[PDB]
RNA sequence: UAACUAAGCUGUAAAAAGCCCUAGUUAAAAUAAAAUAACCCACGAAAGUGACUCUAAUAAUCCUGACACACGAUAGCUAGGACCCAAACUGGGAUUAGAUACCCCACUAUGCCUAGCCCUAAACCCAAAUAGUUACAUAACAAAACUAUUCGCCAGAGUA
RNA sequence: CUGAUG
């Protein structure tokens, strides 16, 4: 499992200059500590799309949509261990798994090297 | 400001209010939250007799503490404030300054719905 | 109960006039809708009957509003006909 | 003003669930309803009671 | 027409003109028509700015001796 | 002659008196106008019952006490016992929507009590207890 | 060939849309003086659109702010605060005829 | 501009040093949020009394 | 020859634009005991009530001043395919050709 | 109308449930 | 009306404007036809149900020496003519 | 659950039965439900959801598609807890020729929380999904008539 | 309130 540190300096305030000179109060408010789950979802999405993909700008690609659905599937599984009776989220997870499997089948039929 | 604590403290004297506010702010800081500002809304009459801690409260001092806190330490501060015998009714909400105001466009003229029935001669 | 007494639904009489103050209070409760709410909360109505009552009352309000609007629109032509006998 | 009518009735073009189920078609008729006569009630009760108050004591 | 875009500014600023409309006269020329007649020529005089085309016609209407009531 | 129908709350400094007493010291007449009976109880401002009279205690019967004349006479029967203890003004608090609602209020005036205000305190739950089922199945 | 033909342009006489009384404002839950202007002074009932005259957003915002303050402890539920009874009347309901 | 804006607000935050003075200044600086509206749509503030 | 679009571009009804709050001189052509049928000239005739002052000065043929509110009163109702035209115009009476 | 067929199936179902209760 | 779109010039702020080129082009043919039927000794009937100009239309038909109907049109006037008008009646050769 | 006052309270077209450890006023936890807003028409795949706050969160760079997978109103079942109020059943009282019904009273399963089942509805908006058109054209009524790709069904009625 | 059948 990935371990994003709470002081990750989230991407909305990561690519801006003059961020390391500011004090620890502003850095703590702009870090992943004071953030919700969506900011960690974005950080995990970029951390996976940087290392798994070869063209992080090509979002409409099949291998990009697969790695974009993988983080949603993992967040749904993280939600499911805490909410067992959540049938709507169980349905979202069981349908996102089928959509990722359909995209994996199309990627296996189109580009086997990227599929492997 | 991220979160807002609409604190209703028991109507007490000045040093007791100051010690209750000191310990409430210190408990807010122990959880890993920085405090932005503290606004005293004044001591008014309660709209209804609030029964808290085996006490019938008719008055109460209103305070507003805004602060940046992680999403995990809100419920713990709520359990901390639920057991305090100097708080009448604690409530932590999102700050209204977080949601940007939208363009209230105004009343759009909606016409009367037509073609709801066929053109049969009655 | 927990609120202060003698504030809500309270009107003061004027010059010993009680009959008219009771009509004023009844108009208060009727314009606020408490009379029909009290008469409706005597027996429990099922949600399907409540939905049917709301839909009937909404269609009836739509019809009454449009009929009153057409009456106020055609009120002009109520004058005497100037071309009688043509 | 008149209540809204868009998206209320059950039609083919209406994608959502119907809000209103009209008993009769919402067509404006060419005649208004006749004025209903008010149900009469017994009168002089508060005066008959004070008239009988004399008899009960005398 | 293009004259309506100036008639809207005239009816937004001054409202109805002082000379009431006479629909019976076929060749009746109103104050808004005089305003757009001044505007079409101030456009030909090489001016592009709308303020320089509007307030100058509003001042040129005083040359004929008419009154303009700016609705505040 | 600026007269407001709103009650004179104690939070203000208004100078309105009835027989020398303030609005808060004037006794209360709680009138529970049910669908089959109408009960009137005149209590002091300190919540001490002074007079009590209902349509049942006046020698009426099952369906007789549900009418409006029974409540009109109940107002007189309560106003007699209230005036006997030195009560000249009262604040009437009505409870419930019944046929003897206004009849008891006018019966207190017919029995010699001056009403200064009418408070409608009817129990209206914000969807709390579920009431009984409907009749005529 | 004709010059006096009408051109397909936008409507210049387009009157601006009417705004609600709180259009481009900030409805809050701490201004019970503002929230009390839309409740009945006798029973505390929240008025509807046909009485208030607010475009669809601010009616829901006012309802949510009133329901929030009434349970947070800022505004009474059964009646209107008499301190805010002398406020300017904005609603279109008339009780005393 | 967001980080430059939050930089200025970091100076007025409440810390362990400013706690005792901020509590005392808040207890002596009462704030009110109440403001009414009119039929024309203009804000009226009760601070004029 | 003159084209219809060229005469319509310079017709006064085109110069008036919207018929809301416009000062128009209209001539009375019919008289009812209390109603005056004034012809402002556009399409229809507006019916106004005879005022209290100078009421005797309003005779058939008298020209008066009007503030036009609507050129023709038409509205739609429940289950109508077309509008319900009133065959009349809406305008108020101000004076009688002040000069 | 359709209530005739609804009542026929209603009587069928009621008699079937009573038969099951008996046997 | 839906069948008025080809006969319209446009819409001047809600009010539809009828073009006059086609108006005159139709009026020329209408006047020619009515003049030819009036030349060939044809019965012409001016029909109009409008309670403002009924007197004007009666006076115009009287000055024209043709016939007029500005009143309530009966049911079987044109179809049931040999029973509504008379035993043997000549129907109008043109209706304006 | 306590204190003052009264002998009545509840109950219906009218009564009776029931409670008088009853009724009115003043204080009161727990449970259940969530007035007005709502003349609003939003969310969710459907069922369903409108007292308040907080956390997580509402698939698909978006065609159709099962007997496969996951859900599925009320009612019902099992184990534990709660029970203000309502209420199947039941027992009394009315009405009736009869009333194991409609009306009144009391009370039980149940409706409430946790976990596991059951997988049914007039689950209907009786109108399948996806992209469209207003051409030809009214069996009747109703929600106007139709295209192109599909899937699921329909072969007289009862039996069923 | 109630009140069956041909
Ligand atoms: Mg309570
Ligand atoms: Mg939907
Ligand atoms: Mg029907
Ligand atoms: Mg009908
Ligand atoms: Mg049934
Ligand atoms: Mg059978
Ligand atoms: Mg008995
Ligand atoms: Mg609620
Ligand atoms: Mg989606
Ligand atoms: Mg599919
Ligand atoms: Mg189920
Ligand atoms: Mg169950
Ligand atoms: Mg159990
Ligand atoms: Mg039970
Ligand atoms: Mg019960
Ligand atoms: Mg029985
Ligand atoms: Mg359903
Ligand atoms: Mg079906
Ligand atoms: Mg399908
Ligand atoms: Mg037919
Ligand atoms: Mg068969
Ligand atoms: Zn608005």
Q: Which domains does chain F have, with CATH numbers?
A: 2-137 (3.30.420.80)
Look at residues F67, F133, F68 and name the one whose alpha carbon lies nearest to residue F103.
Answer: F68
Q: How far apart are CA J13 and CA G30, in angstroms?
A: 62
Give the DSSP per-residue string, K15-46.
EEEE-SHHHHHHHHHHHHHHHHHHHTT--EEE
Q: How far apart are CA E51 and CA A92, in angstroms?
A: 59
What pairs with residue B65 in β-bridges? B5, B38
**Closest residue on chain C to F136 (Cα):** C43
Q: How far apart are CA D28 and CA I79, in angstroms?
A: 7
Resolution number, Å:
3.0
Yes or no: say if A30 and H5 are a contact pair by the CB < 8 Å rule.
no
Yes or no: say if A90 and A77 are a contact pair by the CB < 8 Å rule.
no
G-chain CB neighbours of I8 within 8 Å are 4
Q: What would the two tokens of residue D58 be?
A: 């005398």
Question: From edge to edge, which strands make up the β-sheet containing F28-33?
Answer: C10-12, F114-120, F89-95, F28-33, F38-43, F49-54
Yes or no, beta carbons of B112 and D8 under 8 Å apart:
no
Strand L: list positions under 7 Å from protein Cβ. 4-16, 23-29, 32-48, 51-61, 69-72, 84-88, 101-105, 111, 115-116, 122, 125-127, 138, 141-144, 158-160
Experimental method: cryo-EM
Which one of F7, F131, F135 has the shortest CB-CB distance to C6? Answer: F7
**Strand (E) or helix (H) holding F42:** strand F38-43
Yes or no: say if F53 and F29 are a contact pair by the CB < 8 Å rule.
no
Strands (E), chain B: 3-9, 34-51, 56-68, 92-94
∠A103-A106-A112 over CA atoms, to 5°? Answer: 115
What does DSSP assign to residue K61?
Answer: H
F-chain CB neighbours of C34 within 8 Å are 122, 124
What does DSSP assign to residue F132?
Answer: B
Look at residues G48, G62, G54, G59 and name the one whose alpha carbon lies nearest to residue G21.
Answer: G54
What pairs with residue K44 in β-bridges? K94
Look at residues F52, F46, F34 and name the one whose alpha carbon lies nearest to residue F123.
Answer: F34
F53: nearest nucleotide, CA–C1' criterion: L6
**Strand (E) or helix (H) holding I49:** strand I46-49
**Domain range enclosing G16:** 1-97
**Closest residue on chain I to G4 (Cα):** I6
How much distance in Å is there from the Cα of A77 to the middle of ligand 19?
30
∠K22-K27-K33 over CA atoms, to 5°? Answer: 135
At a CB cut-off of 8 Å and minimum separation 6, what does H24 contact?
B18
Yes or no, beta carbons of B41 and H22 under 8 Å apart:
no
Q: C-alpha distances in angstroms, D15 versus C51, D11, D18, F132?
A: 20, 8, 9, 38
Q: How many helices (H) and strands (E) does chain J have?
A: 1, 0
Q: C-alpha distances in angstroms, K55 versus G55, I44, I45, K45?
A: 53, 19, 18, 15
Please, do chains J and I touch (3+ CB pairs < 8 Å)? Answer: no
**Tally of structural domains, chain G:** 1
> Would you call B100 helix, strand, or coil by DSSP?
coil
E32 touches chain I (CB under 8 A): yes
Q: How far apart are CA I43 and CA I73, in angstroms?
A: 12
The length of chain J is 23
Q: What would the two tokens of residue F83 be?
A: 């005036």
Q: Please, what's the b/e burial string for F18-27 (b: 16 or more CB within 10 A of its CB; e: otherwise)?
A: eeeeebeebb
Q: Which ligand is nearest to the CA of F126?
A: 8
At a CB cut-off of 8 Å and minimum separation 6, what does I25 contact?
E20, E21, E22, E23, E24, I40, I63, I64, I65, I66, I97
């Amino acid at each position: 499992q990935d371990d994003p540190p709470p002081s990750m300096l989230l991407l909305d305030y990561q690519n801006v200059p003059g961020i390391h000179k500011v004090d620890d109060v502003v850095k703590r408010l702009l870090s992943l500590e004071m953030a919700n789950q969506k900011e960690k979802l974005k950080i995990k999405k970029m951390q996976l799309m940087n290392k798994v993909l070869e063209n992080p700008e090509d979002t409409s690609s099949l291998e990009a949509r697969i790695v974009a659905l993988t983080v949603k599937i993992r967040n749904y599984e993280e939600h499911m261990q805490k909410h067992r009776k959540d049938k709507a989220h169980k349905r979202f997870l069981l349908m996102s798994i089928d959509q990722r499997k359909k995209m994996l089948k199309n990627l296996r039929e189109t580009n086997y090297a990227v599929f492997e | 400001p991220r979160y807002e604590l609409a604190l209703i403290l028991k109507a007490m004297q000045r040093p007791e209010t100051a010690a209750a506010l000191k310990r409430t702010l210190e408990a807010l800081m122990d959880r890993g939250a920085v405090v932005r500002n503290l606004e005293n809304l004044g001591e008014r009459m309660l709209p209804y007799k609030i029964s808290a801690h085996n006490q019938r409260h008719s008055r109460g001092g209103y305070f507003l503490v805004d602060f940046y806190a992680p999403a995990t330490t809100v419920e713990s501060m709520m359990e901390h404030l639920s057991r305090d015998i100097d708080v009448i009714r604690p409530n932590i909400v999102k700050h209204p300054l977080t949601q940007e105001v939208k363009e209230c466009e105004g009343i759009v003229p909606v016409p009367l719905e037509e073609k709801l029935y066929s053109t049969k001669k009655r | 109960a927990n609120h202060l007494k003698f504030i809500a639904r309270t009107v003061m009489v004027q010059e010993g006039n009680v009959e008219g103050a009771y009509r004023t209070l009844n108009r208060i409760l009727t314009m606020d809708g408490l009379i029909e709410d009290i008469k409706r909360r005597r027996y429990y109505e099922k949600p399907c009957r409540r939905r049917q009552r709301e839909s009937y009352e909404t269609c009836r309000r739509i019809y009454n509003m449009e009929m009153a609007r057409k009456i106020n629109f055609l009120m002009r032509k109520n004058r005497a006909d100037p071309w009688q006998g043509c | 003003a008149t209540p809204s009518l868009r998206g209320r009735l059950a039609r083919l073009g209406n994608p959502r669930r119907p809000i209103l189920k009209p008993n009769k078609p919402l067509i404006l008729a060419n005649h208004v309803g006749e004025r209903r006569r008010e149900k009469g009630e017994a009168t002089c009760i508060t005066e008959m009671s004070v008239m009988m108050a004399c008899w009960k004591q005398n | 027409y293009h004259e309506d875009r100036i008639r809207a500014k005239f009816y937004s600023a001054y409202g109805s003109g002082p000379k009431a409309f006479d629909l019976f006269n076929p060749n009746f020329k109103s104050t808004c028509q005089r305003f757009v007649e001044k505007y079409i020529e101030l456009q030909r005089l090489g001016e592009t700015d709308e303020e320089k085309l509007f307030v100058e016609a509003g001042k040129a209407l005083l040359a004929e001796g008419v009154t303009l009531r700016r609705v505040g | 002659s600026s007269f407001s129908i709103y009650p004179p709350i104690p939070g203000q400094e208004n100078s309105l008196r009835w027989a020398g007493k303030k609005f808060e010291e004037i006794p209360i007449a709680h009138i529970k106008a049910s669908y089959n009976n109408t009960q009137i109880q005149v209590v002091s401002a300190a919540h001490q019952p002074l007079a009590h009279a209902s349509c049942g205690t006046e020698g009426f019967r099952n369906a007789k006490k549900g009418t409006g004349i029974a409540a009109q006479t109940a107002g007189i029967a309560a106003a007699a016992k209230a005036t006997g203890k030195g009560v000249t003004h009262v604040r009437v608090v009505v409870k419930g929507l019944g046929p003897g609602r206004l009849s008891a209020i006018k019966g207190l005036t017919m029995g010699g009590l001056e009403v200064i205000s009418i408070t409608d305190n009817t129990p209206i739950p914000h969807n709390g207890c579920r009431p009984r089922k409907a009749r005529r199945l | 060939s004709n010059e006096d033909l009408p051109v397909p342009m936008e409507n210049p006489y387009k009157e601006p849309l009417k705004k609600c009384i709180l259009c481009e404002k900030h409805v809050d839950y701490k201004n019970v003086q503002l929230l009390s202007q839309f409740i009945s002074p006798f029973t505390g009932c929240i008025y509807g659109r046909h009485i208030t005259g607010l475009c669809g957003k601010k009616q829901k915002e006012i309802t949510k702010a009133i329901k929030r303050a009434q349970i947070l402890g800022f505004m009474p539920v059964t009646y209107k605060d008499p301190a805010y009874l002398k406020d300017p009347k904005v609603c279109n309901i008339k009780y005393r005829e | 501009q967001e980080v430059l804006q939050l930089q200025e607000e970091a100076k007025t935050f409440i810390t362990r040093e400013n706690l005792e003075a901020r509590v005392e200044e808040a207890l002596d600086s009462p704030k009110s949020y109440n403001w009414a509206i009119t039929r024309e749509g203009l804000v009226v503030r009760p601070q004029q009394k | 020859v003159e084209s219809f679009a060229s005469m319509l571009r310079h017709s006064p009804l085109t110069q008036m634009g919207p018929a809301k709050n416009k000062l128009v001189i209209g001539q009375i052509f019919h008289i009812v005991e209390d109603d005056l049928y004034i012809d402002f000239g556009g399409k229809f005739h507006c019916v106004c009530k005879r005022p209290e002052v100078d009421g005797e000065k309003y005779q058939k043929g008298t020209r008066v001043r009007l503030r036009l509110l609507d050129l023709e009163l038409t509205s739609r109702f429940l289950g109508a395919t077309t509008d319900t035209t009133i065959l009349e115009a809406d305008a108020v009476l101000l004076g009688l050709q002040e000069s | 109308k359709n209530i005739l067929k609804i009542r026929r199936r209603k009587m069928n179902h009621h008699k079937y449930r009573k038969l099951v209760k008996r046997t | 009306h839906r069948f008025m779109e080809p006969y319209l010039f446009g819409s001047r702020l809600g009010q539809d404007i009828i073009d006059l080129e086609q108006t005159a082009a139709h009026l020329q043919l209408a006047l020619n036809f009515t003049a030819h039927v009036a030349y060939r000794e044809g019965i012409i009937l001016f029909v109009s149900r409008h309670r403002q100009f009924a007197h004007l239309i009666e006076t115009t038909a009287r000055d024209c020496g043709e016939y007029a109907h500005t009143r309530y049109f009966k049911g079987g006037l044109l179809t049931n003519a040999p029973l509504l008008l008379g035993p043997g009646v000549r129907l109008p050769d043109l209706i304006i």
